[PDB]
Amino acid sequence: EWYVPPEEYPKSGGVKRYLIDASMVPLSIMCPSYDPVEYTHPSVAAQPVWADPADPRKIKFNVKDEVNGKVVDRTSCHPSGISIDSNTGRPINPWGRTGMTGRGLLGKWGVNQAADTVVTRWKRSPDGSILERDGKKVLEFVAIQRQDNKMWAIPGGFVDNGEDVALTSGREFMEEALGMGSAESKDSLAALFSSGTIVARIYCEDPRNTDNAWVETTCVNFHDESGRHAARLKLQGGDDAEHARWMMVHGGLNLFASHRTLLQHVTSALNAYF
Amino acid sequence: ISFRFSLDQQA
Amino acid sequence: QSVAAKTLLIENEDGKGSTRMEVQDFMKRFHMHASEDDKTGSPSTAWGTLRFPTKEATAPYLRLSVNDDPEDALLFVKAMLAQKYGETYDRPSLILSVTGGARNFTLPPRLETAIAKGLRLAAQRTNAWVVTGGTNTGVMKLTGQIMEALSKTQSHFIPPTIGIATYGVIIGGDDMTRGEPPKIGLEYEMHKKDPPKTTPLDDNHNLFLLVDDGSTNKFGKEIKFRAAFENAAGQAFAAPVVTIVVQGGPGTLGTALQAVRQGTPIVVVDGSGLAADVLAYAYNFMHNPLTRFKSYTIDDLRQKVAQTFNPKSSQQLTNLLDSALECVQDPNLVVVYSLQESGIDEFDDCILKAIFSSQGKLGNKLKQAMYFDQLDVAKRALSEASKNGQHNEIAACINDNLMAAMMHNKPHFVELYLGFDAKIYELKPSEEV
Numbered sequence: 001e002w003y004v005p006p007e008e009y010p011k012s013g014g015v016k017r018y019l020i021d022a023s024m025v026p027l028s029i030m031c032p033s034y035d036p037v038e039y040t041h042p043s044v045a046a047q048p049v050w051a052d053p054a055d056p057r058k059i060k061f062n063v064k065d066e067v068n069g070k071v072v073d074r075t076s077c078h079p080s081g082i083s084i085d086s087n088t089g090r091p092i093n094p095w096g097r098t099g100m101t102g103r104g105l106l107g108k109w110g111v112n113q114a115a116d117t118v119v120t121r122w123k124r125s126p127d128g129s130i131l132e133r134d135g136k137k138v139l140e141f142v143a144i145q146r147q148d149n150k151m152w153a154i155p156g157g158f159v160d161n162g163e164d165v166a167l168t169s170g171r172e173f174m175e176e177a178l179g180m181g182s183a184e185s186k187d188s189l190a191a192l193f194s195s196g197t198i199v200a201r202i203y204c205e206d207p208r209n210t211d212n213a214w215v216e217t218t219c220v221n222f223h224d225e226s227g228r229h230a231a232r233l234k235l236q237g238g239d240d241a242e243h244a245r246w247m248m249v250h251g252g253l254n255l256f257a258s259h260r261t262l263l264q265h266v267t268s269a270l271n272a273y274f
Numbered sequence: 275i276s277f278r279f280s281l282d283q284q285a
Numbered sequence: 286q287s288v289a290a291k292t293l294l295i296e297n298e299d300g301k302g303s304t305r306m307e308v309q310d311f312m313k314r315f316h317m318h319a320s321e322d323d324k325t326g327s328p329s330t331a332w333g334t335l336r337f338p339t340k341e342a343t344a345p346y347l348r349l350s351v352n353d354d355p356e357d358a359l360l361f362v363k364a365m366l367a368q369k370y371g372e373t374y375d376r377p378s379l380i381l382s383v384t385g386g387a388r389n390f391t392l393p394p395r396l397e398t399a400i401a402k403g404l405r406l407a408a409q410r411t412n413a414w415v416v417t418g419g420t421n422t423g424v425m426k427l428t429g430q431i432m433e434a435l436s437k438t439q440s441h442f443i444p445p446t447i448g449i450a451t452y453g454v455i456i457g458g459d460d461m462t463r464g465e466p467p468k469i470g471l472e473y474e475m476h477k478k479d480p481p482k483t484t485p486l487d488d489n490h491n492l493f494l495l496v497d498d499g500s501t502n503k504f505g506k507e508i509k510f511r512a513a514f515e516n517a518a519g520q521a522f523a524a525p526v527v528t529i530v531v532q533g534g535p536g537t538l539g540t541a542l543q544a545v546r547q548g549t550p551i552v553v554v555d556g557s558g559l560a561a562d563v564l565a566y567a568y569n570f571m572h573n574p575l576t577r578f579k580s581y582t583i584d585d586l587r588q589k590v591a592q593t594f595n596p597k598s599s600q601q602l603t604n605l606l607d608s609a610l611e612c613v614q615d616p617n618l619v620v621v622y623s624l625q626e627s628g629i630d631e632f633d634d635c636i637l638k639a640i641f642s643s644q645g646k647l648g649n650k651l652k653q654a655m656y657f658d659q660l661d662v663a664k665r666a667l668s669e670a671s672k673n674g675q676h677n678e679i680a681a682c683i684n685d686n687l688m689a690a691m692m693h694n695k696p697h698f699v700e701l702y703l704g705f706d707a708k709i710y711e712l713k714p715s716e717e718v
C-alpha cells in the first residue's frame with residue numbers, strides 16, 4: 001500500500017528525484033543503493049516568513065516548538081516518530097523515502113502541518129429527498145481546482161505558527177470557497193463553522209514531499225445536516241485556486257495527493273457512501 | 275404507473 | 286451547362302457587409318500536407334463540387350490542413366451559402382453537432398422515428414447547421430437519411446448538413462487530388478476500388494471539409510478542428526452549439542469530454558447503443574433520484590466500460606472511467622433522452638432543456654424557446670424569474686424578445702411578452718438610425 005511520489009518535483013524546472021521501486025519505499029527496509037538528489041526550490045531558498053531556516057540545527061522535533069514565541073506543530077503523526085540525522089542535523093521523514101533530500105517545495109523541515117477543511121452536505125434532489133446509492137447516503141463536498149497543477153483537491157493550506165486548526169480551517173474556507181468573505185449569511189456561516197470535528201491526522205502522499213520535509217495533514221469536516229447554511233454560500237474560486245465546485249464523494253475519484261483517504265475517513269465517520 | 279412504482283421497485 | 290464562379294462574396298471581419306473578390310485569391314490561404322512531416326505545407330488546390338448519383342444538387346468540398354484557422358473555413362461555408370442563396374440567407378440560430386458510432390447499428394424503430402422526428406423538427410424550426418462526420422456508415426448515414434426528407438419537403442432554403450471528415454480514409458482521394466482547382470463537376474464513385482483506404486463519403490451531406498495531416502488510414506485527427514470550427518461558428522452567429530451522442534466508440538467519449546470542457550452542452554440518447562448507454566448509467570448513478578436507480582455501483586460501470594471499449598491495460602480502463610465520470614461532473618451540461626421515461630415527441634424538449642441549462646442570459650433562452658414553439662417552457666421560465674426577483678433582466682430583454690416574436694411570426698408569444706408589463710409603444714430598433 002506504499003506510496004511513491006512522481007520523479008519530477010512540481011515547479012522545480014525539470015529537476016528530477018532519485019527513482020525507486022514501490023517495494024523499497026518503507027523506512028524499516030534497508031535499501032543500500034539509495035542516492036537521492038539534493039534540490040531546493042528558489043521560492044524556498046529565498047527564505048520567506050512561512051519557511052523554516054535552511055540550517056536545521058538547534059531545532060527540537062517530535063514536540064510543539066516555538067518560533068518567534070508562536071507554537072508550531074513540529075510533531076509527526078507517525079508511530080515511530082521523527083529521527084534526526086547526525087551528519088547535518090536535518091530531520092528524517094518517517095513516512096518513507098522520496099528520492100530527494102533537502103526541503104524542496106515544502107517550507108518547513110520535517111513535518112509540514114497542513115489543515116484541510118472539507119465542508120460537506122447531503123446531495124439532495126429539489127423534491128427534498130436525499131439521494132441514496134449502494135445502500136448508503138451519498139455525501140457532497142466543496143473541491144477547488146488548484147492553480148499550479150490543474151487537479152481538483154480539498155481546500156486547505158499549511159497551519160501557521162501560534163494558531164490552531166479552527167482558525168486555519170475557517171480562514172482557508174473563507175479564502176478559497178468564499179473568496180472575499182454578510183448579515184444572515186454570516187450568521188449561517190458562523191453556525192456552520194461552530195461545529196467541526198478533527199476526523200484524521202495522517203501523512204499526506206504529496207508529490208512535493210522529500211526525505212527532510214514531508215506533509216502531514218489534519219482533516220476538519222464541516223457538515224451541514226439540514227443543508228440550509230450550505231445553500232447560502234456564494235461559491236467563487238480565489239487565491240491559488242481557479243474554480244471551486246460541489247463534487248460527489250465516491251471511491252473512483254481522481255483527486256490530488258492522499259485526499260481519497262481523507263474523504264474515506266469523513267464518509268467512514270458519517271456512515272456515507274465511498 | 276402507481277402499481278409499477280408500488281411493486282416493481284419494491285423488489 | 287454550369288458556368289464556373291469567378292468571384293465570391295467573403296464577409297468582412299466587422300460583420301457589416303460582404304466584399305467581392307476572386308476565388309483563387311481567397312483559396313490561396315488553405316494549405317495541404319502530403320509530406321506526413323511537411324509541417325508548413327504547400328497550397329491545396331483540391332476544392333470544388335462533387336456530384337453524387339440520385340442527387341439533383343451538387344455538394345462542395347474543401348481539403349484543408351489540420352493547422353489551418355477554422356475562421357477561414359467558416360468564411361468558405363458562408364461565402365458558398367451567400368453565392369447560392371444570396372446575401373440575405375437564413376442565418377442559423379442553433380449549431381447541432383452530431384457525434385457517435387461510425388460502425389453500423391440496429392436501433393429500435395420507435396427510437397429511430399423519435400430521433401428522426403425531433404432532429405428534423407429542430408433543424409427546420411431553427412434553420413440549423415448540422416455538423417456530422419462524412420463517412421457513409423452509422424450515425425452520419427442515419428442523419429443523412431433524416432435530412433433527405435428535409436431536402437425533399439423544402440423548396441427554397443435547405444440547412445447545410447456539413448460533413449467534416451479526416452482525409453486519408455476517403456475513397457477516391459487520388460481522383461480528387463488529380464486535376465485543376467476550378468473543379469465543378471466531378472463524378473464520385475463510392476463503389477470504386479481503392480487499395481489502402483476503405484471508407485467512402487456519404488452522398489447526403491451538403492458540404493465537405495477533408496481535414497488532412499499527411500497520414501494515411503489513421504482516424505481521429507479531425508476531432509479538434511471540428512470542435513474549434515463549431516465554437517468559432519457559434520461565436521460568429523451568437524448561436525448555441527449542441528452535440529448529440531448516439532452509440533459511439535472511444536473517440537466519441539473524447540469528443541464529449543472536449544465538448545463539456547469547452548462549455549458546450551451534450552444530449553446523450555439512452556437506449557441507443559454502447560457509449561451512450563455508459564454515459565446514461567453514469568448520470569443515473571450520479572444525479573438521478575428515482576427508486577429504481579438506487580442499486581447502482583462503480584463496479585458494474587467499470588465492468589461495462591471494460592466490456593464495451595476493451596482497454597489493453599487496467600490504467601487505461603481507469604483513465605476511461607475517470608474521463609467518463611469527468612464528463613458528467615456538471616449536471617447542466619448533460620441531458621439524457623430515454624424512451625421509457627420521456628415522450629415520443631419530446632426529443633426537441635430535451636434539446637431545449639440543454640439550451641436552457643447552458644445559456645447564461647434570459648433573453649437568448651427565451652429567443653430559442655420561441656424558435657422551438659414551446660410557450661409553456663417560456664412561461665415557466667418567465668414566472669420563475671418573476672418570482673425570484675429577477676424582474677430587471679425581464680424588462681431588459683422583453684423588447685428584443687417582442688421584436689423577434691414579431692419578425693418570426695409567433696402571435697401567441699407576442700401575447701405573452703406583452704402580458705408581462707411590456708409597453709407596445711416602448712419598442713426600440715436594433716440598429717441606430
Ligand SMILES: Nc1ncnc2c1ncn2[C@@H]1O[C@H](COP(=O)(O)OP(=O)(O)OC[C@H]2O[C@@H](O)[C@H](O)[C@@H]2O)[C@@H](O)[C@H]1O
Nearest residue numbers: 384385386387388418420484504505508533534535536537
Ligand atoms: N468517422 C469515422 N468513420 C468511419 N470509420 C471510423 C471513423 N472514426 C473511426 N473509424 C474507425 O472505424 C471503426 C468504427 O469504430 P467506432 O467505435 O465507430 O469509431 P469511434 O471510436 O466511434 O470513432 C469516433 C469518431 O466517430 C465520429 O462520431 C467522430 O467524428 C469521431 O471521429 C473504428 O475502429 C475506427 O478505427
